[PDB]
Antibody, heavy 219, light 216 residues
Framework: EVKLSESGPGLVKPSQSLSLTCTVT?????????WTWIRQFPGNKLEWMGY???????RYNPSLKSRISITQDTSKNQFFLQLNSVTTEDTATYYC????????????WGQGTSVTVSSAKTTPPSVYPLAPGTAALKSSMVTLGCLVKGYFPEPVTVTWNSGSLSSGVHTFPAVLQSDLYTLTSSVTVPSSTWPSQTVTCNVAHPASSTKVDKKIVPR | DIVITQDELSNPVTSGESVSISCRSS???????????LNWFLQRPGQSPQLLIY???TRASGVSDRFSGSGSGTDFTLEISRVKAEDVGVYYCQQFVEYPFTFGSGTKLEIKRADAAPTVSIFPPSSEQLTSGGASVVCFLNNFYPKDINVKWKIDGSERQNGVLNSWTDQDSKDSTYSMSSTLTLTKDEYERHNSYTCEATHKTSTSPIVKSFNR
């Protein structure tokens, strides 16, 4: 019944300071648990960063030297990560988790938040519909898509019909080309339900405050 | 510090089979209190790590009894009984006896299922993109097994390798297949100078390439 959620900038410049917030709901942080930060690098290596426990006790990974501080705001039931003097090596997905003293976290981890360390600039994606060139077999399936092109940094979120279309979607990992990412998403639906029912992809890029819907129309 | 090692699985596992995954530590994880401080996590594709086992053999709340942990103080095994499609992902051990509470490098579990041909779809550049001065041709090769696949592009009958970018999904948690996107990016000018575009998939399930084409 506990829930944890990370928040903070998805882009930080080199030599600057990374700050993240873990908001805890459903359980008090002035407790005997290790309220901890973990990160996962591109390539998927996991690293323990540190914890705060019982409000005033902390411990940090020696790898982080004196760059790291973990603090809390009891009034807001939040704990914080500060990581100073960042480099590109600090690009990672950051997670908060509640560890008990025996190592048990259950599934009390946040969803994670992506932090990219780069001098490059926030760029919004252009979103393009992928319709089929001609007609394909009816009373079968039809695949449609969206091309989410030229954004920085990660991530983007793609849904279809605002989440109503969940099965038969494949959202592919972004590819990086010249400091810009490109991703495609496909969706497969009964050729019965298109183009008779509308199919639209919803693309969000939080970093640039972008939120675009693109309706897939027969060409 | 303690060094944690996890071994590769050499083979994919069929739904229903059981599989054992190994983790080793250079130092004993048995503590003074008689407990052994070793965790196992599953990270499913696209998700946060989820703990399965802590103290070497204790299941977390809600964790299926299909997952069982055993070991000495230095060699540990996670046994996954009666594997389900949803078990696919990477299994990490983590020592919890001393700083820096190191995670192992992970062991990926792949599910073995029946071979399935890719469903291939091709998409001309959108009119919106053409306006912008660019032209991306997109091909999806969806829900195939096994993961090994080749994609080839042809423009007016001649193979094209430059300007192709590929992306591949992790194994699907529901049907144990893989999917791939292939995008051929050209300038609007380049795109207008040719007529026939073909995406061609070579996969074990077909002697001939499975091709999708359109004429500009």
């Amino acid at each position: 019944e506990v829930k944890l959620s990370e928040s903070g900038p998805g882009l930080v410049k080199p030599s600057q300071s990374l700050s993240l917030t873990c908001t805890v709901t459903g359980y008090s942080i002035t407790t005997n648990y290790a309220w901890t930060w973990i990160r996962q690098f591109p390539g998927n290596k996991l690293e323990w960063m540190g914890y705060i426990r019982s409000s005033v006790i902390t411990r940090y990974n020696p790898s982080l030297k004196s760059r790291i501080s973990i603090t809390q705001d009891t009034s807001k039931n939040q704990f914080f990560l500060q990581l100073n003097s960042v480099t590109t090596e600090d690009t990672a997905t950051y997670y908060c988790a509640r560890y008990d003293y025996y190592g048990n976290t259950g599934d009390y981890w946040g969803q994670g938040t992506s932090v990219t360390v780069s001098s490059a600039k926030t760029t919004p994606p252009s979103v393009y519909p992928l319709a089929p060139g001609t007609a394909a077999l009816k009373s079968s399936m039809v695949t449609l898509g969206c091309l989410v092109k030229g954004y920085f940094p990660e991530p983007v979120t793609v849904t279809w019909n605002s989440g109503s279309l969940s099965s038969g979607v494949h959202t592919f990992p972004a590819v990086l080309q010249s400091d810009l990412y490109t991703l495609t998403s496909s969706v497969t639906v009964p050729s019965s339900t298109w183009p008779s029912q509308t199919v639209t992809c919803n693309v969000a890029h939080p970093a640039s405050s972008t939120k675009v819907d693109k309706k897939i129309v027969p060409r | 510090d303690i060094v944690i090692t996890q071994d590769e699985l050499s083979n994919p596992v069929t739904s229903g089979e059981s599989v054992s995954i190994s983790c080793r530590s250079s130092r004993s994880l048995l503590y003074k209190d008689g407990r052994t401080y070793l965790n196992w996590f599953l990270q499913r594709p696209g998700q946060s790590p989820q703990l399965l086992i802590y103290l070497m053999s204790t299941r977390a709340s809600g964790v299926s009894d299909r997952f069982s942990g055993s070991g000495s103080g230095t060699d540990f095994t996670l046994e996954i009984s009666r594997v389900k499609a949803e078990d696919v992902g990477v299994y990490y051990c983590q020592q919890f006896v001393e700083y820096p509470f190191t995670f192992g490098s992970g062991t990926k579990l792949e599910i073995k299922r029946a071979d399935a041909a890719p469903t291939v779809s091709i998409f001309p550049p959108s009119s919106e993109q053409l306006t912008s001065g660019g032209a991306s041709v997109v091909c999806f090769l969806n829900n195939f097994y096994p993961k090994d696949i080749n994609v080839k592009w042809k423009i007016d009958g001649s193979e094209r390798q430059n300007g192709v970018l590929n992306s591949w999904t992790d194994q699907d948690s529901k049907d144990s297949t893989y999917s791939m996107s292939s995008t051929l990016t050209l300038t609007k000018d380049e795109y207008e100078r040719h007529n026939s575009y073909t995406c061609e998939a070579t996969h074990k399930t077909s002697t001939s390439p499975i091709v999708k084409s359109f004429n500009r």
